[PDB]
Swiss-Prot record, chain B:
Source organism per UniProt: Dictyostelium discoideum
Induction per the UniProt record: Up-regulated by P.aeruginosa, PAO1 strain and PA14 strain infection and down-regulated by phagocytic stimuli and growth on bacteria.
Protein name as catalogued: Probable polyketide synthase 16
Active site: 100 (proton acceptor)
Extra remark beyond the main annotation: Encoded by one of the numerous copies of polyketide synthase genes and clustered as a pair pks16/pks17 in chromosome 2.
Region (N-terminal hotdog fold): 69-145
Summary of the function given for this chain in its UniProt record: Probable polyketide synthase.
Entry's free-text remark on domains: Modular protein that is responsible for the completion of one condensation-processing cycle. The beta-ketoacyl synthase region is responsible for the actual condensation reaction while the acyl/malonyl transferase region is responsible for incorporating carboxylic acids units onto an acyl carrier protein (ACP) domain.
Residues of the full protein shown: 869 to 1013 of 2603
Length: 531, 145, 48, 96
């Protein structure tokens, strides 16, 4: 036997090299979001006066007065000078697009890639969206309308604005299929990477809530919860709260990503997305057991894995007493034959933690699974005090994560992502740990460790700091100073020098600082003495 | 200091190759390429010079007030003051009206006009010189009057 | 002369005088008429 | 309404009885950018009946056809306003 010559023969091996998000509860960067999930953060809060009055809920026009929202100023804030958006055009730009641009630049900053190196190179941009709430706020009167509305709020611009702002020449689309739109975009990105269209694909989805219209219409059909807390897989399941936010992830061919040595969260082994249609179905808004079963089976076959090697699934559990048992039994028919209660199949739902994302649920689940894969652990699940009696747990060898669980240190982990739109669409993907082993990675990672005592390490470096405006640079450096204690213990100063040298891009407000460690950094923080 | 100033004044500096940070030697393992890539994740991202932009026509503000618990209703800002209102007695804030059954119809209270009078002129000593109820107001079920 | 109960008509009503109280206040006057009738209000003058 | 009627007409044109195509995976990519009927509905936010979104949302342009003909393929709908349907043509070529 020979272990050599193993290759990503599937063009269904596409890695995720970074992300960026604005999720309810304050998640803004993978580390903080991870620390928030591990502490059972509940992003559900109260929808303030800004979106709509409270008078709706008390008269049960909008059945619940809760929602997983960003702070309402975090929708408003922007920096239109940075992206060449004249402030005359800023008010007419959709806040969803503002979120996309800001979080996309943040995602690039995360992915150790300077956007300057990516201008003029084909890189597809698939984003998801279903609502135009800001546009309907604009169109409350048809006597004013200024000619810069549509160009700031149309469907095209959600993706095309990013494309124009970053010279990404790949195919640029935006997707509906409301509840699974962004996950559909993930699939389309995988498509556009596998078929040789492009060497990189940026994929995400957004969802903004700025008008009570859609919320009232959903509450009328009693899809939304009545108490106000999203509660997955329990008896208290009464409906799913609607939330805000958005995000993106950067996908790059696995061979290319390992070739340049970037931080690989996970590897998509592929998947499929189909639709209920009329199979075992009564009408539109009634998820089909058989359809989701077939979707799971097709994705499993294409990914070239066995159902006996699925360690987790990001269930689409909303908190409806109707759909949750249906989809759980659908999962059961596939997996209950290949697990035992001592080592069952674990499920979960980010919808519990952050509320249900109405249109960006796909990217929420994708980011959560990517984080859980990178950190080799499973996040807890909240609001889980009593299982819904319609769910047969021990009869199906199915378990729900209740506490943080560490991965076994000897088995490759495969996890599946489920998210069904209300219009019947089901989109599922199989994600997995990056196939680069980390048990033997200790020897090579210890090569820079235990090597800080040499005299060449006492050399003081010239760490740059770059930003567009002066105030941004000052904010950055003040933030760096304020964390003197945290960084001194987890990051060797040499790694910080490498990071500030390579990861950041060169912007106009350039600054240089000389230091050799953290104490030297705080000491020579500035050299403004007489020059 | 010289390199600092040339970087500041517009000259691009390859700081990486300058200090031999990146692998300039033949041997540099996978850890040497990605150790900082994995350890610097906690660093703050690009701080933005945040400015607040927003534009909602006041009509949208006048629409987002939704229904009104009291019987005065919400204000249509126009000319002489104008107090509009929609009623669906099945709802919670007007459910008590269903107790006013007359000849089998949920008739609007006579004193509802008095309450509206007091509300519109809240917090002042008031005199109603006269008040005349001419036509009856019938409130059906599930129809917004 | 009669005692009028005081209870809010709805959990969202927190003003002093509900319409219900004001309308009920006319019941004492109405009691004073006797014999079968179909009485509907028509006017009221000089409320303070 | 136009999509369903013209889709049945297209099947009648294509010498294919839709009965033979029920329950067989056949992707459905359609294009759309406007929701003018929905905005006509939402001229007032005191009435809105709970059957509006399910009759006018983005999802349903393609998913309604899919549910009405048992086409189990991937079902999406595309913006990119002036070339949306042609983009859908490309996506259909992809899915085939």
């Amino acid at each position: 036997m020979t272990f050599n010559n193993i290759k990503d023969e599937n063009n269904d091996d596409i890695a995720i090299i970074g992300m960026g998000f604005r999720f309810p509860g304050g998640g803004n960067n993978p580390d903080q979001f991870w620390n928030q999930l591990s502490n059972k953060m509940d992003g559900i809060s109260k929808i303030s006066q800004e979106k709509w009055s409270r008078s709706f809920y008390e008269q049960k026009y909008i059945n619940n007065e809760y929602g997983g929202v960003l702070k309402d100023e975090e929708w408003k804030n922007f920096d239109p000078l940075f992206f060449g958006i004249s402030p005359k055009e800023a008010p007419t730009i959709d806040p969803q697009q503002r979120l996309l641009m800001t979080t996309l630049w943040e995602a690039f900053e995360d992915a150790n890639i300077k956007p300057s190196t990516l201008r003029g190179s084909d890189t597809a941009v698939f984003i998801g969206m279903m609502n135009l709430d800001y546009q309907r706020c604009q169109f409350r009167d048809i006597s004013y309308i200024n000619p810069y509305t549509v160009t700031g709020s149309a469907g095209s611009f959600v993706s095309n604005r990013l494309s124009f702002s970053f010279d990404l020449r790949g195919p640029s689309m935006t997707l509906d299929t409301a509840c699974s739109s962004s996950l559909n975009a993930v699939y389309l990105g995988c498509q556009a990477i596998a078929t040789g269209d492009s060497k990189m694909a940026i994929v995400g989805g957004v969802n903004g809530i700025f008008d009570p219209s859609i919320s009232m219409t959903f509450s009328g059909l009693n899809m939304l919860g009545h108490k106000g807390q999203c509660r997955s897989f329990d008896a208290g399941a009464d409906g799913y709260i609607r939330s805000e936010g958005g995000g993106v992830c950067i996908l790059k061919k696995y061979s290319d990503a390992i070739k340049d040595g970037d931080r690989i969260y996970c590897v998509i082994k592929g998947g499929s997305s189909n639709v209920d249609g009329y199979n075992a179905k009564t009408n539109i808004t009634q998820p089909s057991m058989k359809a989701q079963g077939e979707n799971i089976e097709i994705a499993l076959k294409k990914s070239g894995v066995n159902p006996s090697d699925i360690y987790y699934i990001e269930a689409h559990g909303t908190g409806t007493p109707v759909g949750d048992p249906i989809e759980i039994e659908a999962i059961s028919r596939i997996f209950k034959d290949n697990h035992t209660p001592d080592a069952p199949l674990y499920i979960g739902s980010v919808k519990s933690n952050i509320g249900h994302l109405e249109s960006a649920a796909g990217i929420a689940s994708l980011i959560k699974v990517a984080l859980s894969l990178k950190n080799r652990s499973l996040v807890p699940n909240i609001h889980f005090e009593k299982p819904n009696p319609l769910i047969k747990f021990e009869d199906w060898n199915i378990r729900v994560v209740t506490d943080e669980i560490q991965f076994p240190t000897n088995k490759l982990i495969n996890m599946g992502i489920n998210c069904f739109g209300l219009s019947g669409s089901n989109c599922h993907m199989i994600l997995s740990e990056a196939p680069i082993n980390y048990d033997e990675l200790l020897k090579t990672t210890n090569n820079n460790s235990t090597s800080s005592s040499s005299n060449d390490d006492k050399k003081e470096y010239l760490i740059p700091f770059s930003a567009n405006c002066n105030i941004s640079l000052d904010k950055y450096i003040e933030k760096l100073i304020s964390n003197q204690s945290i960084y001194k213990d987890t990051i060797l100063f040499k790694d910080f020098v490498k990071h500030q040298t390579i990861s950041k891009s060169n912007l106009i407000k350039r600054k240089v600082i000389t230091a050799s460690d953290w104490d030297d950094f705080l000491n020579k923080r500035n050299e403004t003495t007489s020059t | 200091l010289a390199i600092s100033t040339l970087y500041c004044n517009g000259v691009e500096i390859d700081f990486a190759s300058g200090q031999q940070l990146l692998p300039t030697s033949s041997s540099s393992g996978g850890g040497d390429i990605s150790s900082f890539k994995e350890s610097t994740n906690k660093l703050p991202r690009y701080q933005w010079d945040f400015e607040e932009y927003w534009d909602e026509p006041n009509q949208s503000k006048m629409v987002k007030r939704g229904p009104s618990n009291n019987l005065l209703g919400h204000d249509q800002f126009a000319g002489n003051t104008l107090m509009e209102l929609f009623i669906d007695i099945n709802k919670s804030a007007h459910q008590y009206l269903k107790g006013h059954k007359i000849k089998g119809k949920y008739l609007f209270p006579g004193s509802g006009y008095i309450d509206n009078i007091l509300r519109q002129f809240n917090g002042q000593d008031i005199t109603i010189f006269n008040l005349e109820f001419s036509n009856p107001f019938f409130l059906k079920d599930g129809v917004q009057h | 002369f009669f005692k009028l109960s005081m209870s809010p008509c709805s959990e969202f009503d927190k003003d002093f005088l509900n319409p219900s109280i004001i309308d009920c206040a006319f019941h004492g006057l109405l009691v004073l008429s006797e014999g079968p009738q179909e009485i509907v209000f028509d006017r009221l003058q000089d409320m303070k």
